[PDB]
Design a protein around this ligand. Sequence first.
Ligand SMILES: *O[C@H]1O[C@H](COP(=O)(O)OP(=O)(O)OC[C@H]2O[C@@H](c3c[nH]c4c(N)ncnc34)[C@H](O)[C@@H]2O)[C@@H](O)[C@H]1O
Length: 178
Amino acid sequence: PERKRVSKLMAYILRHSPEEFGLRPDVEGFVSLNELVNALKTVYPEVTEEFVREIVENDPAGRYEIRGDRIRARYGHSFPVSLDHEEDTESRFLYHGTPRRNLPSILKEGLKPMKRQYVHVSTDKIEALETGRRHGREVVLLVIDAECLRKRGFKIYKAGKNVRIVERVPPDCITLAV
Ligand SMILES: *O[C@H]1O[C@H](COP(=O)(O)OP(=O)(O)OC[C@H]2O[C@@H](c3c[nH]c4c(N)ncnc34)[C@H](O)[C@@H]2O)[C@@H](O)[C@H]1O
């Protein structure tokens, strides 16, 4: 209950609107941990640094990263950020879940970042489908040839446990839609 509310607000601050709370993330997307706790307290005042450190440690998707006294979101940003994730050179197939209503536009334009900086995909079929279900009920599973992306210059990076980021996904690299 309360853990999900604080995590949703953390993602809003660290991915989209930090300046709304007086925060200035560095080029790599990090903000001061102390600054984040004080920002969160203006909405939920009974939050501590230990409560936030428990969220980061127990995050099932690996959303957040703490380097000492700093904290950032690892992906999902809507403002420019210089990330240092490792490249995914092993995956052959990647997956992306999206409402079926988006398929005609995707089959002509490919996957675009839209309001975010990068296109997000997954190595896990269940995670991709759950991600698509956020936007609507009827969801299709897209299968993406990873080597198709690499041969066209689009490197894939390991942003989370199963989450992967890439600049875009041309339609020719989408092999299947189920
Ligand atoms: O942690 C969460 O955030 C990550 C991003 O989630 P996604 O659902 O992948 O993206 P999001 O920005 O919220 O939604 C964008 C939406 O737009 C669709 C899309 C992509 N490309 C096109 C084109 N060309 N035309 C029309 N629509 C689109 C995407 O499929 C998506 O539904 C992720 O890690 C998630 O867990």
